[PDB]
Amino acid sequence: LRIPKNWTIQRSTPFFTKDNVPEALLTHHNTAVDVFGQICVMEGVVTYYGFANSEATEPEIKVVINAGQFATSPPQYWHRIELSDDAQFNINFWSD
Amino acid sequence: SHLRIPKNWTIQRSTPFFTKDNVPEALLTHHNTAVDVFGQICVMEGVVTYYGFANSEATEPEIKVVINAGQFATSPPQYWHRIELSDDAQFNINFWSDQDKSGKKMFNTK
């Protein structure tokens, strides 16, 4: 899935690091029912683990996101992210 | 090496997606971000070429950066630049700031 041309960012999170990231993101969870999660890495590395559904124990996809890059999370898709000790990222949520 | 936006900064405003079909002409020519405002250009599709200038009246670029899909680049406060798009380029821009910028200008032209 690609984010539609007419979609926009309803909300953006502040910058998160190993020091102030919300435990909720570091855990196996999913995005809003109809929202695309765009993860932008400013510094360090963020590793993205995707799962076919909420039951899967092993990931069906692993993506390494480096500084200067971003990876999107399709609506309703289950995932978990791990951050290197110097990671700095934020997430933009597209919908509407 | 894109410059790092400090962790304490926050996004004040974000632009919708743009393509060579509806991109504001202000981005195609010289412009800079307002004081205390860091620009971030995310390329969702295609290619966006970035041209930076030493100052308001510099004619030839001091920096050229090619930004591909999945990548983003940053432009520090008041730094003059312009962007060029590929035929299938799709991108947007996030404006960060370490100060409340509500109501004020995000970018300057000319």
Side-chain angles (χ1 to χ4, degrees):
Chain A
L1 278 180
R2 59 180 294 174
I3 307 173
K5 186 178 74 291
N6 60 302
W7 279 37
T8 67
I9 298 176
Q10 78 170 181
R11 57 154 174 152
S12 288
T13 69
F15 273 123
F16 295 129
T17 59
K18 64 172 201 300
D19 328 293
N20 64 316
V21 59
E23 302 188 66
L25 294 168
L26 264 55
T27 71
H28 165 278
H29 78 290
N30 68 165
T31 60
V33 303
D34 301 300
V35 180
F36 267 108
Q38 183 197 190
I39 300 177
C40 299
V41 189
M42 185 63 247
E43 163 78 299
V45 180
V46 173
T47 307
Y48 183 99
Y49 290 104
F51 303 81
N53 47 266
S54 65
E55 266 93 73
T57 307
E58 277 50 53
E60 67 169 359
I61 180 175
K62 175 175 169 148
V63 180
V64 176
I65 317 171
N66 288 279
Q69 313 180 307
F70 70 73
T72 69
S73 197
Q76 298 175 297
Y77 192 75
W78 292 78
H79 62 276
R80 181 179 61 80
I81 59 168
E82 293 187 347
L83 334 170
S84 61
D85 304 311
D86 57 334
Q88 179 188 316
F89 69 102
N90 98 283
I91 306 164
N92 303 318
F93 296 100
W94 303 71
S95 57
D96 192 36
Chain B
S1 163
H2 58 307
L3 307 171
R4 180 198 118 163
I5 300 180
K7 321 158 299 179
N8 61 289
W9 291 47
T10 297
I11 300 179
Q12 309 291 313
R13 183 264 175 89
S14 303
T15 77
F17 282 120
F18 296 129
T19 312
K20 298 203 75 175
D21 199 0
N22 69 302
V23 64
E25 185 48 77
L27 300 174
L28 305 180
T29 46
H30 291 51
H31 71 287
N32 68 337
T33 52
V35 59
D36 313 302
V37 178
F38 226 119
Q40 173 183 54
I41 303 172
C42 299
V43 180
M44 184 55 72
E45 178 178 66
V47 180
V48 175
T49 297
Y50 182 94
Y51 295 104
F53 302 90
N55 58 60
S56 60
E57 41 200 295
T59 59
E60 294 296 347
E62 67 160 354
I63 181 175
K64 179 186 175 173
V65 180
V66 182
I67 317 167
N68 307 84
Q71 312 178 307
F72 74 77
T74 68
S75 38
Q78 308 188 302
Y79 186 71
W80 295 86
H81 63 277
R82 72 187 180 67
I83 59 174
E84 189 170 305
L85 286 59
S86 69
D87 294 347
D88 53 341
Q90 185 190 312
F91 72 103
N92 88 289
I93 302 171
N94 301 156
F95 293 96
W96 300 72
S97 183
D98 63 325
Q99 305 290 304
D100 167 52
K101 276 289 171 179
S102 63
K104 299 202 66 191
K105 266 286 178 180
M106 292 302 95
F107 63 94
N108 306 294
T109 183
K110 178 189 71 294

